[PDB]
Design a binder for this molecule. Structure first.
Ligand SMILES: C[C@]12CC[C@H](O)C[C@@H]1CC[C@@H]1[C@@H]2CC[C@]2(C)[C@@H](O)CC[C@@H]12
Ligand SMILES: C[C@]12CC[C@H](O)C[C@@H]1CC[C@@H]1[C@@H]2CC[C@]2(C)[C@@H](O)CC[C@@H]12
Ligand SMILES: [Ca+2]
Ligand SMILES: [Ca+2]
Lengths: 176, 176
């Protein structure tokens, strides 16, 4: 299975950005496998607005961390086991009603409840997903961390491929 | 080791309430072991103000759930494995800087960051801890649940015993 490096060069920007049309979404889940020895960094970021409607899944002290900022909630939460042990880990993020669920290696490790309304029914119908980086300065995070994540990603599926509008990459993706 | 039932009668109120003087606190951690087959309910509640400075640790769908409401954050978060398997489980809740940490059976399963300033340096210097129930109607929770927790508690330590002002129990505690 083809795998890509989650950091390019200095690791100051995402390795890829995908844009989706929220009105065409019929699937909200995203899943992938990640391998790394890096204890801190951004796995993926998402927003419909970089100022007040954004989300970030990363690692801090080797463990998953989600920072989220929208009309309903603003939080910085760590959960789950360390993933920086150099082993492949299955990760899944999805919506379940008004909640965001995080599953690691088959187990639910975190459920952020009351954080969102239906996606398709959101104001701005365009969602951006960035891999290995944010779409705003790391210093503007609720809790800053250094975004560079020295790791590999494979078997990824992002939201609903049928709603994907476009995909870009500042620089060509590197294979692991 | 002596153990007590976490629910008395209809399970509409806590089995015990302890009050502490925050200025005398030198230890914030609380720990105990719990056993139960009940998937939903309140393990313990805490506040300095039932309207806008409160906290609740309970179970929903068998898993830990924390609801917290204060000047800095307002959240409803689920995390960790199910604990309603009828086996004894070690649980520890403590402050680590501005974060609230939750450990289950020796493992950190949840860290709510940026949710609080130093306790000793809080406005109202009195904190109440209630076991097996809340100090306000369940309907006023951020996300209501039925508080009755049919389970047993033992080996409990609450905050700093040297700062404990008093302890009450609506009805006499029952042994498991
Ligand atoms: C977590 C989700 C959904 C599951 C999907 O698998 C990944 C995306 C990333 C973007 C999140 C969105 C949930 C809703 C958010 C928090 C909006 O309020 C602002 C950014 C959005
Ligand atoms: C979680 C803590 C601390 C660890 C201790 O072991 C238990 C108590 C319960 C009460 C919490 C407090 C943390 C600060 C809170 C959220 C205040 O803002 C309002 C209620 C307080
Ligand atoms: Ca890193
Ligand atoms: Ca119950």
């Amino acid at each position: 299975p083809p795998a890509v490096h989650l950091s390019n060069g200095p690791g100051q920007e995402p390795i890829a950005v995908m844009t989706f049309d929220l009105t065409k979404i019929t699937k909200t889940s995203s899943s992938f496998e990640v391998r790394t020895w890096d204890p801190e960094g951004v796995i993926f970021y998402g927003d419909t607005n970089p100022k007040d409607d954004w989300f970030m899944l990363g690692l801090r002290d080797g463990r998953p961390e989600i920072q989220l900022h929208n009309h309903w909630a603003q939080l910085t939460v760590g959960a789950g086991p360390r993933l920086d042990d150099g082993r492949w880990h299955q990760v899944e993020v999805k919506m379940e009603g008004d909640s965001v669920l995080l599953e690691v290696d088959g187990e639910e490790v975190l459920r952020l409840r009351q954080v969102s309304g239906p996606l398709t029914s959101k104001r701005h119908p365009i969602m951006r997903i960035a891999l290995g980086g944010l779409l705003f300065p790391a210093s503007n995070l609720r809790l800053p961390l250094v975004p560079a994540l020295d790791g590999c990603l494979r078997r990824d599926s992002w939201l609903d491929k049928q709603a994907e509008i476009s995909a870009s990459a500042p620089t060509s993706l590197r294979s692991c």
